[PDB]
Chains A and B, each alone.
With several copies, the nearest count.
Chain A
């Protein structure tokens, strides 16, 4: 989740 959406 921390690394998500661009």
Chain B
């Protein structure tokens, strides 16, 4: 079972886990309590299983959309910081981690995807998606591609699908209607159709994943990519002269990425709940704590007001916020996992030609 007297933390391998480990080391030096940070694969899927038996990490980090499902299963401890502490973070970030009237995690950062481009290959990035095919043709004649991003995770294609009207669950009367989905409406069909056509016209490969896309952009093989703040560190190391800006528009409409609030939840079966709260409230959610993680891998716009003010000057953060505002905060309801799996299958099947765009989305709707 979970050992008492130590803290085990899980966070995605793409995030600044080494920076988080430094915060853990400071905690141990001050309290004598050991902190172990790990970054398992598919941790958001592994947590429910291990936490079910009553095991798993003391703290789990992930975008808030997965937390509602965890709470419904009773896998998360309710957190109750005093109102004063709550005032140190933006009000909307707390709403993102509120389920059935109870807070179920500590918000850490607001993540939104942006268009990242190579200034040496494209000084002026396209304002619309409709311009990409012509731009790719031109660049292809030069041995390069216009755009490459992860097509295996729906998170990355969603901004285009939602651009012309696609949506997950209809929100009415103050609640999400699970039975009213917008993944197969006119707008969603138009968006995925455009993406599939880009593939059919050899402007993108249906097998492109995170690693492939990252390598391509960092090696200067593609003029643009779509990714989040965490990716900036690797790009800085590649020394590519890049810019981060607003995603291209589709049919005159801005792209609408699903906005995630990176959050830290506490395992309901943990015998170290108060220790976890002290680590999160007194060490991580401080300017110095977030800086340590951010220095490792950019968190993007943080939930902590005091630190966000310091990151506001960064043009890359301004672009992140601009895209976030054009998109929408993800719901945290339990049905989100079904939604994500459904869209993932639809995109992969349509992109690979296993199904027509219309039928792939019709099935995602169901």
Chain A 1-6 interface 0/1 with B at a Cβ cutoff of 8 Å (1 = within): 111110
Rounded to whole Å, the gap between the CB of B334 and the closest CB of chain A is: 7
Q: For the side of the interface on B, what is the size category?
A: 10 to 19
Chain B 335-354 interface 0/1 with A at a Cβ cutoff of 8 Å (1 = within): 10011011101000000000
Q: Are the C-beta atoms of A4 and B366 separated by less than 8 Å?
A: yes
Q: Are the C-beta atoms of A3 and B181 separated by less than 8 Å?
A: yes
**A interface, over-half SS:** loop
CB-contact partner of A1 in B180, B334, B364, under 8 A? B364
Residues of A within 8 A of B366 (CB): 1-4
Which residue of A has the minimal Cβ distance to B168?
A: A2
Rounded to whole Å, the gap between the CB of B337 and the closest CB of chain A is: 8
B12 within 8 A of A: no
Q: Are the C-beta atoms of B341 and A1 separated by less than 8 Å?
A: yes
Residues of A within 8 A of B278 (CB): none
Rounded to whole Å, the gap between the CB of B251 and the closest CB of chain A is: 23
Which residue of A has the minimal Cβ distance to B338?
A: A4
Q: Are the C-beta atoms of A2 and B339 separated by less than 8 Å?
A: yes
B178 within 8 A of A: yes
Give the contacts of B12-54 with A (CB-CB under 8 A): none
How far is it, in angstroms, between the C-alpha of A3 and the C-alpha of B170 when the chains are bound? 12
Q: Are the C-beta atoms of B334 and A3 separated by less than 8 Å?
A: no
Residues of B within 8 A of A4 (CB): 335, 338, 342, 366
Residues of A within 8 A of B178 (CB): 2-3
Residues of B that sit less than 8 Å from A by CB: 168-169, 178-181, 183, 334-335, 338-339, 341-343, 345, 363-366
Instruction: Give me the 8 closest cross-chain CB pairs, A-B, nearest first.
Output: A1-B342, A4-B338, A2-B342, A2-B181, A2-B339, A3-B178, A3-B179, A1-B366
